[PDB]
């Protein structure tokens, strides 16, 4: 499936990853994951392997082979994997979650011995890699965000709102752009700058962008650094234009009959193409495709029986 960009991958509480065609709705293949649920999916820069974050393990699958074996399954962690990220050369992998550490694997080794790990004193909700630079941004349940220098172990501590946890972060490919969200209804945008020094600085506050959606669960930027999308536990998703952070549009799955409302949470989204489509997950048991430019709908994928949370796809081949 790695060879054809049309294939989208979804996962949820059915203990399987399903691969289907974005523009036809035809299901093409499945991968079994009976050991646990999947917390996150990701595709390597090599466009030929997909990772899945499960319970007490991180597992790799071959996206070209017809025998999706656990290629180099990293059996460890012992509690939870919040997310899995990859470095751009395909050499390193980054993990958050529990125990409260940011652990980095040197993926070519067959051992789980790591060359670096950062101790954090609350569970880690998200880990991001700075574009084109060996630095991590780690979001914790304590409300703190830490920046770690992968080359020196130096760091910076950011605690903009100690009362609430950080729930998600994503740093735009454009090194000057944000962002992260917390559990109480607001997104923060600070200017990215810095220089040479021991402390891994500097962020300079720019604007506070309220959502008023009780969360959010996921913050994500488009490939063209133009759009910012936010998904929450509520039945909506909002998209702002980064040139001024004004609201451009809004997506919603709310029921038209309140008696059957709150069918499920919008567990994240992803941009596809040059800001052409949004691939959305939903706990109500299907995936949906939306157009960012018009709001035109709808394509659906309902191969699952239980709630669907994770998204991944071959955006480029």
């Amino acid at each position: 499936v790695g060879s054809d960009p049309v294939i989208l991958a979804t996962a949820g509480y059915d203990h399987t990853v399903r691969f289907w065609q974005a523009h036809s709705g035809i299901c093409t293949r499945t991968v079994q994951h009976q050991d646990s649920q999947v917390n996150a999916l990701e595709v390597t820069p090599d466009r030929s392997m997909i990772a899945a974050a499960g319970y007490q393990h991180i597992r790799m699958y071959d996206l070209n082979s017809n025998n999706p074996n656990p290629i180099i399954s990293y059996d460890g962690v012992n509690k939870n994997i919040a997310s899995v990220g990859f470095h751009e050369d395909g050499r390193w992998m980054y993990t958050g979650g529990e125990d409260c550490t940011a652990r980095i694997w040197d993926l070519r080794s067959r051992n789980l011995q790591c060359q670096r790990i950062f101790q954090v004193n609350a569970p880690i909700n998200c880990v991001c890699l700075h574009p084109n630079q060996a630095e991590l941004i780690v979001g914790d349940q304590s409300g703190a965000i830490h920046i770690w220098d992968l080359k020196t172990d130096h760091n910076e501590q950011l605690i903009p709102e100690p009362e609430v946890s950080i729930t998600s972060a994503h740093i735009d490919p454009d090194a000057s752009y944000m962002a992260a969200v917390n559990s109480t209804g607001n997104c923060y945008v600070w200017n990215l700058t810095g220089g040479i020094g021991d402390e891994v600085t500097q962020l300079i506050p720019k604007t506070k962008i309220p959502a008023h959606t009780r969360y959010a669960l996921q913050c994500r930027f488009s490939p063209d650094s133009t759009l910012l999308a936010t998904c929450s536990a509520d039945q909506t998703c909002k998209i702002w234009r980064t040139s001024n952070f004004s609201l451009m549009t809004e997506l919603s799955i709310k029921s038209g009959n309140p008696g059957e409302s709150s069918r499920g949470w919008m567990w994240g989204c992803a941009f596809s193409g040059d800001s052409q489509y949004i691939v959305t997950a939903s706990s109500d048991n299907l995936a949906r495709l939306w157009c960012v430019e018009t709001g035109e709908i709808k394509r659906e994928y309902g191969g699952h029986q239980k709630a669907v949370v994770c998204l991944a796809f071959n955006d480029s081949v």
Partner: protein
């Protein structure tokens, strides 16, 4: 003091003012109390100020001279205050005991104490004789002599109130303790016409009937088997088996012991031979054969225990069946101002209660013809319950003296707790209370409602819940909550009432009782509170709690499944209140109780400090956390923070309604409830 505080420049000025006030009116209790307390505070002040720097012996000599300057008149002050009042002298008595135990070895404090003690009515010591007892081992002969003389004098006048804890003390495994106890009991044998022997007879037979040979061999072999086959701890296994065989070696005395011996003795002796063969040769296979024998014994015992429903005294304790007016007071009551109710007879048989553990019901007949029902239970240390009941007594007294709490009839229901040994005792029976769990179970059964609907729904949505992340658990929890109306209790409270005029009052008592225990449990630090620990009074509507074990915040640090909720306030409990919710009666009652607790802080601290530093109980907390003196200090500081409005943050001082609102929010948020162990059912 309020404007400047306490420091080296203010102490003598406040003391001068208090001294002048005392001289102006020498009969006024408050003047003497305030002076004695200020001197006590000065003693702690100088000790604290030196240790604060030394740890973070010329100094010791400087402290001895300075503290003696303060301490002797502090003792005299407290003694005078005690002599000027009755009934409410508990706090002063405890402070005297504190100064005595810590500084009594100094000749000047000793002299002050001797003159003090001679001048005090002997009856005022009765309120403090679970604390003088078990300090008799103090390695300070001066204090030892004082304790022994005081206890002897007390026994001379009120032996009925003393014989119980001394009888228990005489069974202690520490040489010094049972020896001192024996000396005191020997004096009592002369003073009480050998009442001591009757007390020992009853205590020993009562202890023996609590636990049978079948139960001891069942648990013993279960643990020894775990050690042999699981851990492979052969040494530990032998250590576990050893006392069981040594116990059997004394031979049977009762009919049950004889039957047990006839049924299992041979096989146990063969097992002994196999173990000895292992010990001599090292042949573990001999232990395997011994374990086959133990297995057969264990299995046969496990078939039979569920069929035991009652015991007759003729087979376990014929000595009790044949009684006789024993000249002993009924264990649950004694009042020096009333006639003593004597034990007239013991019920011919005991009823066994089947559960994970098996308490037995006893009934005694007294000299007044009344029945007294006690619950006899082994395998537990009841001294914690005794101390908690004493605290509750104090709290009820403090509430009784506030007109607001007289108009709003607030109180805490208490129990009778009587330890018999380190692992057994009696609990008073409360005749009309029903466990909350049973009430809900029976309701759902009558209506054909499955007991676990919420759980089944959660599993159907996501049949892996136990291993999900926080936000997933929140989603599933809220879904299940929103799929059913949690108001079974609200319906039960109405269906069981004879009329609206009764229902209304019952609901009022329910709400106020819950608010009172919410605030007291918070200050105490009461831990695990789940549907099997709370009971409702079938007639009055008041709420009881029956398991005062993990009474401090050690119940917030268990290895698995916290323990985030400061007190239980579930949706089913809130729905039983007025249709407006928590606002109103509940919140206001919490405000009133917290204000009373804050106003009288020093009495509460005196009792809690006396408990925390008790060398025989404090270990229950030591095993969990940290130098015990440091942890005990941290615990006291935490209590003071709770009682001074500095619990949530040490950088501010919160008002009563602010603290209460913060506590309610913490106790209701879904994020904390979703983390609780399923046994502590968060959706009930």
């Amino acid at each position: 003091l309020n404007l400047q505080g306490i420091n080296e420049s203010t102490i003598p000025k406040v003391l001068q003012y208090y001294s002048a006030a005392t001289e102006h009116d020498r009969s006024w209790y408050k003047a003497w109390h305030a002076w004695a307390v200020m001197n006590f505070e000065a003693v702690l002040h100088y000790k604290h100020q030196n240790q604060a720097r030394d740890e973070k012996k010329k100094v010791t000599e400087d402290l001895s001279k300075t503290l003696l300057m303060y301490t002797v008149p502090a003792v005299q002050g407290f003694f005078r205050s005690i002599s000027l009042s009755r009934g409410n002298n508990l706090q002063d008595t405890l402070r005297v005991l504190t100064l005595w135990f810590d500084y009594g070895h100094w000749p000047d404090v000793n002299e002050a104490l001797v003159e003090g003690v001679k001048a005090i009515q002997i009856d005022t010591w009765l309120q403090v004789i679970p604390q003088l007892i078990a300090r008799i081992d103090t390695p300070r002969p001066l204090v030892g002599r004082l304790i022994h003389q005081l206890l002897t004098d007390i026994g001379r006048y009120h032996p009925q109130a003393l014989i119980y804890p001394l009888t228990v003390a005489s069974k202690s495994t520490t040489t010094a303790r049972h020896n001192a106890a024996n000396k005191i009991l020997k004096n009592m044998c002369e003073h009480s016409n050998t009442l001591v022997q009757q007390a020992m007879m009853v205590s020993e037979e009562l202890i023996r009937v609590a636990i049978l040979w079948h139960e001891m061999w069942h648990e013993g072999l279960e643990e020894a088997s775990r050690l042999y086959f699981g851990e492979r701890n052969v040494k530990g296994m032998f250590e576990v088996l050893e006392p069981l065989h040594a116990m059997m070696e004394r031979g049977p005395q009762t009919l049950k012991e004889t039957s047990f011996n006839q049924a299992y003795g041979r096989d146990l002796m063969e097992a002994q031979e196999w173990c000895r063969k292992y010990m001599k040769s090292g042949n573990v296979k001999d232990l395997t054969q011994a374990w086959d024998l133990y297995y057969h014994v264990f299995r046969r015992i496990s078939k039979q225990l569920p069929q035991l429903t009652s015991l007759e005294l003729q087979y376990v304790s014929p000595k009790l069946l044949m009684c006789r007016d024993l000249e002993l007071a009924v264990p649950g009551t004694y009042d020096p101002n009333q006639p003593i109710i004597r034990i007239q007879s013991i019920a011919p048989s005991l009823q066994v209660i089947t559960s994970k553990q098996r308490p037995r019901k006893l009934t005694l007949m007294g000299s007044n013809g009344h029945e007294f029902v006690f619950l006899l239970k082994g395998h537990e240390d009841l001294r914690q319950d005794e101390r908690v009941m004493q605290l509750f007594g104090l709290v009820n007294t403090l509430l009784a003296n506030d007109p607001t709490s007289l108009r709003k009839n607030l109180s805490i229901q208490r129990y009778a707790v009587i330890p018999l040994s380190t692992n057994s005792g009696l609990i008073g029976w409360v005749p009309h209370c029903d466990t909350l769990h049973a009430l809900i179970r029976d309701y759902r059964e009558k209506k054909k409602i499955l007991l676990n609907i919420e759980h089944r729904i959660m599993l159907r949505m996501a049949p892996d819940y136990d291993h999900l992340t926080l936000m997933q658990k929140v989603e599933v929890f809220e879904h299940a909550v929103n799929n059913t109306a949690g108001d079974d209790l609200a319906k039960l409270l109405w269906l069981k009432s004879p009329s609206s005029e009764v229902w209304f009052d019952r609901r009022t008592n329910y709400t106020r009782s819950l608010a009172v225990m919410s605030m007291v449990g918070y200050i105490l630090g009461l831990g695990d509170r789940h549907p099997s620990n709370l009971m409702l009074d079938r007639l009055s509507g008041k709420i009881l709690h029956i398991d005062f074990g993990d009474c401090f915040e050690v119940a917030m640090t268990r290895e698995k499944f916290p323990e985030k909720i400061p007190f239980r306030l579930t949706r089913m409990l809130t729905n039983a209140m007025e249709v407006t919710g928590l606002d109103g009666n509940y919140r206001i009652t919490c405000h009133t109780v917290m204000e009373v607790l804050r106003e009288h802080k020093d009495s509460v601290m005196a009792v809690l400090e006396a408990f925390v530093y008790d060398p025989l109980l404090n270990w229950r907390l030591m095993d969990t956390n940290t130098a015990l003196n440091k942890k005990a200090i941290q615990i006291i500081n935490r209590v003071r923070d709770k009682l001074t409005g500095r619990d949530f943050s040490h950088d501010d001082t919160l008002d009563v309604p602010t603290q209460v609102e913060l506590l309610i929010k913490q106790a209701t948020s879904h994020e904390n409830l979703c983390q609780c162990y399923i046994g502590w059912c968060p959706f009930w």
